[PDB]
Chain A
Amino acid sequence: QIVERFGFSEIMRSTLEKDNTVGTDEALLDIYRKLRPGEPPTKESAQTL
């Protein structure tokens, strides 16, 4: 669906391609450990904030 919305631009396609991790529950923990480092990452502890 992301490709569906931002497909008219090559820069967004290249962003989704050059991405490191894929998955709804993966990028979420990525954000958590970069936003509040040093804490155990719970799926719901990140979904809450």
Chain B
Amino acid sequence: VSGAAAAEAALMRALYDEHAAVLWRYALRLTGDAAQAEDVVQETLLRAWQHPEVIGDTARPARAWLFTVARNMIIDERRSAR
């Protein structure tokens, strides 16, 4: 039924509220740029939504999985971009 297509949203909006405002700070310290951090956060959380094999085991740290996603994306930008 439709309640499930709504449960997807209410599942994301329930991890945003607990992890986006903290993931932002990670990418901030690593970039010193709140604008990129703002971008990186959405990029990461989109991947998270795209990779449900991580949040399903609620009892396991998702935040810990997210930090590495971002930390990798930043350096991907820090390749020979100089």
Contact residues of A with B, CB < 8 Å? 36-40
Contact = CB atoms under 8 A, between A and B. Distances in A.
Interface residues of B, number: 5
Majority secondary structure of chain B interface residues (helix, strand, loop or mixed): helix
Interface of B: 17-18, 20-22
Contacts of A38: 17, 20-21
A15 B21 CA distance: 33
Nearest to A36: B21
Contacts of B20: 38
A38 B17 CA distance: 7
Contacts of A40: 17-18
Contacts of B22: 39
Nearest to B21: A38
Nearest to B18: A40
10 contacts: A36-B21, A37-B21, A38-B17, A38-B20, A38-B21, A39-B18, A39-B21, A39-B22, A40-B17, A40-B18
